[PDB]
């Protein structure tokens, strides 16, 4: 004897040592990126390639 | 043969109820209700094959054979 089975319910495990099928189905999919940067250039320049005489002390 | 149609007419499925009486004793006799189960048009003059019916628990408490009594 196995106790009142129903008829039109779906066949689910109930007590233990009922039997159930998995699917395994895991796709996990994780992923992270950054960055960053700096950049700082800089030039100067002064010629006085002919000075005049009025400026030839400074 | 597995591979094979079989296309009949003269059968149909058919789902039988019946009431367990109380103090009911092996060998008794009790009526059965016949109702058919997928797409057949009558159940006129047919006759019901050994069935087993069966309780809650799926115990098998009689077994139903007989002709059935279609109105008209």
Redesign the interface.
């Given at each position: 004897n196995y106790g009142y089975q129903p008829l039109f319910e779906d066949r689910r495990p109930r007590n233990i040592g009922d039997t159930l099928t998995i699917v395994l189905q895991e796709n996990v999919s994780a992923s992270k990126s950054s960055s960053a940067n700096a950049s700082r250039d800089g030039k100067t320049s002064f010629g006085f390639d002919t000075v005049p005489r009025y400026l030839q002390g400074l | 043969p597995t591979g094979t149609n079989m296309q009949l007419k003269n059968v149909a499925a058919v789902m039988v109820t019946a009431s367990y009486p109380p103090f009911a004793r092996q060998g008794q006799t009790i009526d059965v209700v016949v109702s058919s189960m997928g797409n057949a048009k009558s159940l006129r003059g047919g006759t019901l094959l050994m069935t087993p019916l069966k309780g809650?628990?799926?115990?098998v408490y009689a077994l139903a054979q007989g002709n059935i009594l279609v109105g008209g």
């Open positions: - | 809650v628990d799926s115990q």
